[PDB]
Design a protein around this nucleic acid. Structure first.
Ligand code: MG
Ligand code: ZN
Ligand code: ZN
Ligand code: ZN
Lengths: 48, 263, 49, 113, 56, 147, 57, 45, 67, 61
RNA sequence: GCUUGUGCUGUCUUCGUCCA
């Protein structure tokens, strides 16, 4: 049941490398992660 | 055909005169130096403890604006172009700050000299905060009283001033041409007499004033440009000029490659 | 002791200058929330008629 | 909230070509070039370099909107010359000018050091 | 954390704890009781940790 | 038409940047001799009609902690009110709803960092909390300025 | 005040959080950019879309 | 289980959701929660 | 609140000159002469040091919330 | 702990309390209130003692 | 195989914003 929901995550690739966030939506292969650094939420692939 | 003549030279500013170039080339060079020369600046702040009276993001914004030595930033890679998971030593520089006030009286000032470089690229002269001298304390970051502590870990990345003004190596580029207005590129507002109501340019002695009987020359173009490049200390003035030229060359070469590969 | 206490507190809290059961026909807006947006605004509010 | 990311001014998406060329059939030997993630810095340089070539009869550019980082350039040469060759010649000539400028500045700086 | 409890007097009674002899070999002592001593406030852990409880 | 052009680099360097604070209040009400509200992290099992936000940022006592980034509709105060139980005691293994959610969500259009959480008692001796949220507002197209 | 205060425009999606107008239409709306706000209503049918594009444009 | 700080003497302690809301050593009625242990990161912009 | 790191208009670093400015004013130098001695030529930079109000000295007078 | 136990512990520590800035300010305020009460009662003897105590406690830095 | 969580008053009052 999407075990990574509401868990702290870090981005390793792309334009947001090394930013801490929290996973909000876990439909599939496209995770919505809110960023702690600015006040916004972005989509991101699971591999990232 | 182009010529360069240097008037004053310093570590932080150079005053030079360009000649036999188009106005567009000089302006593009000025724009490139202002907003397209890569430098190194703090881009992530991890705040492990902050009991000072300043907000966390207040101090983060202040830290991002501190200039860091960016001499060997060419060897460094962009964060988005590094295949390493997380940040490695080849795409980031880690600085750490730890400040505390001891005793129950007095106030402690936190300066940028307290930023200590922990990790970075091997043997590359990058990351150290810029200091005017060996005894210069640097930029004032915060103030602390008894039992207030600041403990942070900052990560510096490579970028350009287009993305954020903290990566700009230059402060203000004075730019000027045609002190005596022989080209009539500007029309002078006046009340009584336009000649005695307008201050002379600081380079007015470098060009012969027009003769009283001289007619207007419609075949003339701006030919000599006077420009002063001031830096924040992250890069020397000559380094800023040379790297602006190199960046412009790289941009044009990329356009040329795109054209040649289009067919 | 509740009479005076509740009457004063109600009139100062709501701004209706009168008894609680005679809210209609009473002069309203006498008491207002202090404006603390900036120092000048507070000073202006404290000297208003 | 609706503010775009600042890196979109210069970072090119994979699906977006850096340089798209389409002919302009209203007049002979004319092309329209669309530069992506560029601004006045490259555009003005190219325009004023090309304006001096005797075989280039029309060159212009415009930035449609300041909030989008791209510009479109119109070029139109004589009958003998293909416009893309003129654009390549302009790029190479400006590169040589910048190279000699850098060399002369280095010489002067070493002299006055 | 617990010396000011009213029941702490009976709680500490009979307990065995490590003691600094001072005169240092740590040894064990048996609590025969406690006695509050006014005017003998002492730093317990820090400067602010004033304590009047004493252990016999 | 009364617009103005602002320098983006000056905005980047801190011109006209400001700080925004908003506080939320909540308290435990007393409805009777033993009907009280409780500050707690409600569970999907023992409570009914929960808010659509997320409760994962609440601590054990039902209050968020300072330093935590919050977004719109997140729950910053967890409160439940008792409800007379139904006949679910028939065959439910203690998993029957006895409490109703009365949590306080963050405003939908606002987000920021939890700055300071205050816990105390009101005049009546019940619990009483105040949560202050902090964010930074940078000038952008549409902000109003004046000389 | 008058029927030129409601007119139908064509949408163009843009960044940032303000409605944007060509400045020639600020006269019929009696609007300037010192803080004014304006209302936008979306038609929800083909018939209504045709009415807006053919009458109120 | 969760730390707290007094509003006057700045004394750290903890509560068990059943103690009266009060500082143990000075009896102040106003206490504050302590900062979270999670990582806090900012973009320095 | 505290002296800005960079001048808003151009970007010169003025955050390291507050203490020197106060020291110069202490010795009796005039404000214009003090600003000139720090090599602040452009008036955009001069307004940053000239019109700065130091409020952190008032925030620091409140007893720290932790210990 | 109960409310009464908390009050007892607070009073015990107050007896142990050598000095605390918040408590010193509270004591000085209470002394000022007592002094105005004595002044309104025209008690010229108590007011002298309260003034002496206030002078001894004061002189902050 | 352990499976995901949908809902908000109302009435006064005041203070503001843009036109007028
Ligand atoms: Mg208006
Ligand atoms: Zn790397
Ligand atoms: Zn306390
Ligand atoms: Zn300046």
């Amino acid at each position: 049941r999407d075990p990574t929901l509401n868990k702290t995550v870090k981005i390793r690739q792309g334009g947001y490398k090394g930013k801490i966030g929290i996973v909000k939506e876990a439909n599939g292969d496209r995770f919505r992660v809110e960023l702690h650094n600015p006040n916004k939420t972005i989509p991101i692939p699971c591999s990232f | 055909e182009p010529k360069v003549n240097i008037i004053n030279a310093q570590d932080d500013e150079v005053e030079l005169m360009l000649s036999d170039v188009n106005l567009s080339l000089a302006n593009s060079l000025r724009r490139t130096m202002l907003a397209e020369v890569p430098t190194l600046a703090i881009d992530l702040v991890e705040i492990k403890m902050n009991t000072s009276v300043l907000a966390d993001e207040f101090i983060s914004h202040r830290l991002g604006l501190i200039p860091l030595v960016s001499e060997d930033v060419e060897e460094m890679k962009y964060s988005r172009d590094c295949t390493c998971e997380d940040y490695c030593d080849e795409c980031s520089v880690v600085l750490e700050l730890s400040a505390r006030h001891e005793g129950e009286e007095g106030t402690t000032d936190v300066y940028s000299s307290s930023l200590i470089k922990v990790s970075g690229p091997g043997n590359l002269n990058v990351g150290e905060p810029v200091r005017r001298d060996d005894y210069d304390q640097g930029i004032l970051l915060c103030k602390l009283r008894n039992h207030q502590e600041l403990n942070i870990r900052c990560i510096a990345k490579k970028g350009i001033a287009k993305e954020h003004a903290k990566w700009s190596p230059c402060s203000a580029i004075a730019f000027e041409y045609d002190p005596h207005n022989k080209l009539k590129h500007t029309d002078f507002w006046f009340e009584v007499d336009a000649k005695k109501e307008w201050p002379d340019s600081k380079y007015a002695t470098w060009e012969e004033p027009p003769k009283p009987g001289e007619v207007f020359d419609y075949k003339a173009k701006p030919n000599r440009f006077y420009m002063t490049v001031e830096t924040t200390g992250s890069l020397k003035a000559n380094q800023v000029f040379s790297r602006g030229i190199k960046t412009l060359q790289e941009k044009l070469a990329n356009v040329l490659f795109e054209l040649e590969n289009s067919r | 002791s509740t009479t005076i206490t509740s009457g004063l507190k109600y009139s100062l809290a709501t701004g209706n200058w009168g008894e609680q059961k005679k809210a209609m026909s009473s002069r309203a807006g006498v008491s207002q929330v202090l404006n603390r947006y900036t120092y000048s605004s507070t000073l202006s509010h404290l000297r208003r008629t | 909230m609706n503010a775009p990311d600042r890196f979109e001014l210069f970072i090119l998406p994979d699906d977006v070509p850096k340089l798209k060329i389409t002919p302009d059939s209203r007049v002979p030997n004319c092309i329209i070039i669309k530069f992506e993630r560029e601004d006045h810095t490259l555009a003005n340089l190219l325009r004023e370099e090309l304006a001096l070539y005797p075989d280039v009869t029309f060159v212009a550019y415009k930035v449609e909107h300041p909030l989008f980082a791209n510009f479109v350039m119109r070029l139109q040469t004589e009958e003998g010359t293909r416009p893309k060759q003129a654009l390549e010649r302009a790029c190479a000539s400006i590169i040589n000018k910048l190279k000699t400028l850098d060399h002369k500045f280095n010489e002067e700086w070493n002299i006055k050091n | 954390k617990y010396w000011y409890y009213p029941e702490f007097d009976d709680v500490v009674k009979g307990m065995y704890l490590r003691l600094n002899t001072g005169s240092s070999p740590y040894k064990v002592v048996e609590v025969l009781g406690s006695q509050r001593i006014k005017g003998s406030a002492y730093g317990l852990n820090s400067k602010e940790n004033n304590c009047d409880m004493y252990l016999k | 038409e009364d617009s103005m052009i602002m320098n983006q680099s000056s905005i980047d360097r801190g011109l006209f940047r400001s700080l925004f604070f908003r506080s939320y209040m909540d308290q435990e009400k007393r409805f009777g001799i033993s009907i009280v509200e409780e500050f707690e992290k409600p569970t999907r099992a023992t409570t009914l009609r929960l808010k659509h936000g997320t409760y994962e940022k609440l601590d054990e006592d039902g209050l968020i902690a300072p330093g935590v980034r919050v977004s719109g509709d997140d729950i910053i105060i967890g409160k439940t009110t008792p409800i007379p139980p139904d006949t679910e005691e028939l065959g439910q293994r203690t998993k029957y709803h006895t409490k109703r959610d009365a949590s306080t969500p963050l405003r939908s259009t606002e987000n920021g960092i939890v700055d300071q959480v205050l816990l105390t008692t009101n005049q009546e001796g019940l619990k009483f909390v105040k949560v202050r949220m902090r964010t930074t507002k940078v000038p952008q197209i549409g902000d109003k300025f004046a000389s | 005040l008058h029927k030129m205060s409601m007119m139908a425009h064509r949408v163009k999606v843009m960044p940032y959080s303000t409605f944007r107008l060509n400045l020639s239409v600020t006269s019929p709306y009696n609007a300037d950019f010192d803080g004014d706000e304006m209302n936008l209503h979306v038609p929800q049918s083909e018939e209504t879309r045709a009415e807006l594009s053919q009458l109120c444009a | 289980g969760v730390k707290y700080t007094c509003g006057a003497c700045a004394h750290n302690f903890s509560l068990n959701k059943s103690d009266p809301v009060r500082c143990k050593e000075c009896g102040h009625r106003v206490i504050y929660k302590a900062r979270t242990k999670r990582m806090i990161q900012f973009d320095a912009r | 609140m505290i002296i800005p790191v960079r001048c808003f208009s151009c970007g010169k670093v003025v955050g390291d000159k507050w203490d020197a400015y106060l020291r110069l004013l202490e010795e009796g130098k005039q404000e214009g002469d003090a600003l000139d001695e720090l090599k602040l030529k452009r008036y955009c930079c001069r307004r940053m040091v000239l019109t700065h109000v130091d409020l952190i000295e008032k925030f620091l007078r409140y007893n720290p919330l932790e210990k | 702990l109960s409310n009464d136990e908390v009050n007892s512990i607070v009073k015990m520590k107050q007896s142990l309390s050598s000095n605390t800035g918040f408590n010193t300010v509270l004591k000085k305020a209470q002394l000022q209130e007592e002094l105005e009460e004595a002044r309104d009662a025209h008690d010229h003897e108590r007011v002298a003692r309260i003034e002496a105590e206030l002078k001894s406690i004061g002189a902050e830095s």
